[PDB]
Amino acid sequence: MKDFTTYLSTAPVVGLGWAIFTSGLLIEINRFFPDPLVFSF
Amino acid sequence: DIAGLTPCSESKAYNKLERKELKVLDKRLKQYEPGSAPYLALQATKERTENRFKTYAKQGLLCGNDGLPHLISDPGLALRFNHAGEVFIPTFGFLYVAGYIGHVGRQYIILSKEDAKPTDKEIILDVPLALKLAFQGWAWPLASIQELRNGSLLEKDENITVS
Amino acid sequence: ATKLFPKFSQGLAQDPSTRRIWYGLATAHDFESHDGMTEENLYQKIFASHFGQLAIIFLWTSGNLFHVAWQGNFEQWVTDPIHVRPIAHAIWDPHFGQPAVEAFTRGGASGPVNIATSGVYQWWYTIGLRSNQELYVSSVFLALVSAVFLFAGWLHLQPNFQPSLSWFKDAESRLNHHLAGLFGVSSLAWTGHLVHVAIPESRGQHVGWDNFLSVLPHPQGLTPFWSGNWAAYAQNPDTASHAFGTADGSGTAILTFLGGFHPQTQSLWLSDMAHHHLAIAVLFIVAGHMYRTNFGIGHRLEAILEAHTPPAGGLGAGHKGLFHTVNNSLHFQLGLALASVGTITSLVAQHMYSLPPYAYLAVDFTTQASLYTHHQYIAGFIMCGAFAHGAIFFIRDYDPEQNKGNVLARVLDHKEAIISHLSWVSLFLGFHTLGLYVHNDVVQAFGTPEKQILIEPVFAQWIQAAQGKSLYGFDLLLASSSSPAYSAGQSLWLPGWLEAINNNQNSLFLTIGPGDFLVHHAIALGLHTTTLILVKGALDARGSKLMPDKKDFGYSFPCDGPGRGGTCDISAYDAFYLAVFWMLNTIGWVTFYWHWKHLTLWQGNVSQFDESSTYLMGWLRDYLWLNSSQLINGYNPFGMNSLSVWAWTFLFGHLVYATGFMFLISWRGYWQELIETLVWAHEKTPLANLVYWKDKPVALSIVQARLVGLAHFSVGYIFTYAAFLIASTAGRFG
Amino acid sequence: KQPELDPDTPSPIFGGSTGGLLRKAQVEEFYVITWESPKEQIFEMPTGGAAIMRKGPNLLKFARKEQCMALTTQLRSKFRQTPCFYRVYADGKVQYLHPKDGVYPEKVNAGRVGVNQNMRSIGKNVDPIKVVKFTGSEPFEI
Amino acid sequence: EIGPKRGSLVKVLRPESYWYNQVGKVVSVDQSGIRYPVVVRFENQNYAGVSTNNYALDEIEEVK
Amino acid sequence: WPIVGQEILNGDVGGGFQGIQITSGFFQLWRASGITSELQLYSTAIGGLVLAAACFFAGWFHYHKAAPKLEWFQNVESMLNHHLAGLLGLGSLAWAGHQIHVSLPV
Amino acid sequence: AHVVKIYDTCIGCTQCVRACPLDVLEMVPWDGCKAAQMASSPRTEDCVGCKRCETACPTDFLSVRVYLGNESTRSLGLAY
Ligand code: CLA
Ligand code: CLA
Ligand SMILES: CC1=C(/C=C/C(C)=C\C=C\C(C)=C\C=C\C=C(C)\C=C\C=C(C)\C=C\C2=C(C)CCCC2(C)C)C(C)(C)CCC1
Ligand code: SF4
Ligand SMILES: C[As](C)(=O)[O-]
């Protein structure tokens, strides 16, 4: 468990956890909010 | 009227392009029954395409002789008009996010220079420290300007050069 | 130790290899690292070299004039310059077949010929020429001057004629003579030419040598120059409907400043250029009187640079000690000269497609692009050479003792900051340009052109509106009427300028669409990256952090060994290598942009550009794949035509390009073992061991390898692009 | 006592190869190596394959100088054997090179005087000023 | 007694040295007497991968 | 997935379904096995995934629990007579018996 | 040939000689700490310029630098 949590600080973590968070966030923003190309005002 | 461009509602080419797209969609939309899945998919696609074309034409965005939208990037032309969102506020939003990122990364890489073998911390990150600094950088303009007046970011010429 | 070719290498003479041959053919012009080449024995050799190269230039121009007079159809061009096309030279190649003689016979008055894309007919007829004898005369004259320079280069070699060393350091008098004589006096002579021959030839008058002794170039001839009232020479210019081969509505004005275009010929008024060059000559003469001489007081250089010192110490010593620094270094002057020549070459290329000075020139649609790309690549290479010699300065001629406190030492001290900011601007441009292009490609791939990003270039359009453009409606200088800039100069050059600027068919401040934004930013990326490479190679020349003692191994050395984790392409020569690659890229992007802009403009469908210049699939499809059908169909089983040679040259360019890649990818060490194997095989072939090679065969030097690789790269790039630009244009005419 | 070259020396048992021994070896030069090699053994050749070697001093020869320094270093590697070098010119003149000191240049021998060196910190050399002569590559002190 | 105290960190001023203007602890200032007495030790590697070097006493200077 | 217009890639291929055309050659390979409905490929994939899990299990087992010795690895005789005869011959006979009893539908 | 130099920056590690493939440089008296040797280039007729002696020299900055010069049969490694 300890060595596993230590292993979870490398490429297989943020760099995966990161950029997975970001791809998901961007895809969800483009899905709920379909086609933005200019701000509200 | 700026740059010889006209608001994008009065563009005959823009409406012709919308009609062209809708015809091209419907010609292969008529291949499926109203109950199947592909038909619903094409219906939703047409929905948000019509939504594209309707929602753009609000608060004003200029389309040219080609009918396509053209972004105005000069501050001053986005002012005295209604174009401050074309690219004027997105600039500040990206500046905010990029600040945020650089601030957090710099404070991380600095707070790691004190412990033994910092190189390890660059291949085996300090996840809780990174999470803490990630939720403390959304005031960075305040910290940056006053950390600049402070002087804790100028290195007093103690680096490796060759000349 | 063993003497042999060449005469200027004792270390390369003992070299038992073919390497010395290549280094002799290469270092034959490096007149500074040879054995025993002190200064005063070098200026005379370089001066004879200037004479030789000038002789080469004049002999080139003489051959051009000769083949235009004898083999060219210059008579067939002057009368009706629209119904005919130029001809360059004939062909005695026995390899052509009967269809080939029938395909290269556009003219009809002779056998196989070749079109003339030099643009010499227009420039030779605008200055005034309507006979082939007038061309033979000039060709013979240029041959004679070439011989004269060939002799003058030799005259200063034997004693009683060899100059001294103090004759060159006198930069004051030489710069005076060049600013006044080389520029001003020649410009005034050119004004005389324009006013005595070019104008009379524009009136269809057959005025030449035999009659100019009494021809009055202006009523009340030369009296206003005596009795004042200069304005009398600009009271009857060329009529709007003026004929250029005849006198259909002519005038007697010589110094005109209406500032417009000659409608028939579609070029600047033949009389505007006279007053142009007259003002230029007067101003250069005024400039040429600035310096101190034997008896002319003026003001010397040593007291000026040492006086330009900001008192607040923002620069330190200012410019003290730079006179002795520059005047005692030829590579610095060469760098400045090449930089100026390249920048003014780009300027002339910019000014030739927008302000046509030559009558009946803008109507031709093939020589324009050819000459523009010519000057663009010439300027690119000249700028790269300027930076190369700027680095050679730091490598070879530098004395930081004299330079303790000047601006050059300061520039060398913060070199890391300059390099880092160049890297940053390059990264910014590349990132954002490629991102917008990829975005537009992906958006077009989904079938929704509305979702693309199109930044409206408000700045260039604003500057045009200030110039006089009204298509954009910014209500600015020279576009509104409540400004002193629009009011003043109403009878001046303003009417012609404003009439030629709003024209949507000539190349003068074209209608700029958002597709120009992206390409200008790509050009900025290319320029910043090439300048990054060159400035980095130049600043990290005396010594870098990896190789501190770089000043000891000269300029062009392969590498510093495989030690220290790897040291490849570290010499400044290698940075020049890569910067020439980027020069090719940048000039190629610039030429693609210009060519495709004027191609969409000539088809009357500029909207094609305004709509397809937004992404990369358009550049690939609408320009490269599209406008090449005559290149592929230049020769086929159906039968070839005049465009076959250009297609074969288009393939030759690709072959040279791939040979460049051959010399670039594969490096030396691999080939040494193969050459040793071939030597083993050649020495053991039965009864084939007769008279041997005279020099040992080895693999090309790494420096030589990459030099020849980049040479093939550049030459194939040039030939391919030129063959395309010529064939896809002079075959379809549309 | 540095030993000099001796012709008519036996050679190790080997078939042949295609390395070296070209026109250069006949009219320019050839290099020679000699070494003890007790306990008849198997070795590898730098320009060929494997071969056998009798006991007692045996002599070899190749084309390039490195082709023998490689064997000297090998001999260092496994069993302590102490070969030597020789040079040959066109006139037949022979020159002894390795090891002149007899103690393998990596180790000092009682006392000599070396050349091509100067007592100066790394860098701090002369700028291209006053170096117009340039004498090929300057020793900076001569 | 000649060079700085052992264990005290000091910077470098060798113009041609990878380590320049940055600090490094001293291993042992050579007391036996030699032109490069101070042996400084650095944690970060160089292009060659070496950690230590010996310098002259006229080149090193005080702490930051 | 419908996100940014990528659904245009769902080419109209018929069969009451749209998607991306595949050029791998799996439908023609499956038709030679008498598959009549989709309900069989699910179980086939389940079996394949169980076999892959067992394969990783065997790898871990022979590395950390049953790590062999060079005597076993160097059994060229056994490795051949079991690859050549068993792994190849037995598999070929099984697949031939399969094609014999599946030649009715195709 | 290849002008080889040896500066005073040296410790006498005896490594650039057990690494040189052509046995070009020697090590004769130097007044050091524990080993007390300094390198020297007495002969250069056989030096090829491989810069293998510059890779093993641990001195910062390097003690030996090969000034590349002119080529010959020895300098081009030519068995022919
Ligand atoms: C109002 C008072 C005043 C002011 C404002 C100035 C201002 C100036 N003087 Mg002056 N002077 C003054 C009074 C003043 N002077 C008086 C009373 C005297 C005595 C009578 C003089 C005598 C004097 C002399 C003799 C000279 C000057 C010179 C200069 C100029 C250079 C000074 C400098 O440090 O450059 C700034 C230093 C820099 C390093 C600026 C860096 C520029 C950056 C790096 C450019 C970035 C490049 C980048 C790619 C471009 C992107 C642009 C971006 C910013 C958008 C400068 C503009 C000198 C001059 O003319 O220039 C040579 C000089 O010769 N002065
Ligand atoms: C199409 C080929 C190609 C490309 C793409 C580049 C790109 C680049 N070159 Mg280069 N160059 C090339 C050919 C190429 N070169 C060749 C043939 C030569 C001669 C051999 C040179 C010689 C050369 C020199 C001498 C220099 C460069 C430099 C640069 C960089 C400048 C940075 C910039 O301007 O902004 C950005 C440019 C980009 C290309 C960024 C786009 C890449 C995107 C972001 C990829 C993103 C991928 C995605 C996020 C995930 C993929 C990763 C993984 C999942 C697979 C840049 C990255 C200069 C440099 O290093 O800058 C300081 C430098 O001085 N080049
Ligand atoms: C490497 C090197 C070198 C080289 C350098 C170079 C190459 C430079 C350059 C440069 C350049 C290439 C520049 C350019 C520029 C530009 C400018 C300088 C500008 C400007 C401005 C102005 C003032 C203008 C104005 C105007 C007018 C007048 C009117 C109209 C408008 C306008 C705006 C146009 C040397 C040898 C030296 C040194 C060493 C190093
Ligand atoms: S390798 Fe360098 S530090 Fe070591 S003994 Fe030789 S010259 Fe001195
Ligand atoms: C210079 As005004 C015509 O505005 O008085």
Ligand SMILES: [Ca+2]
């Ligand atoms: Ca226009």
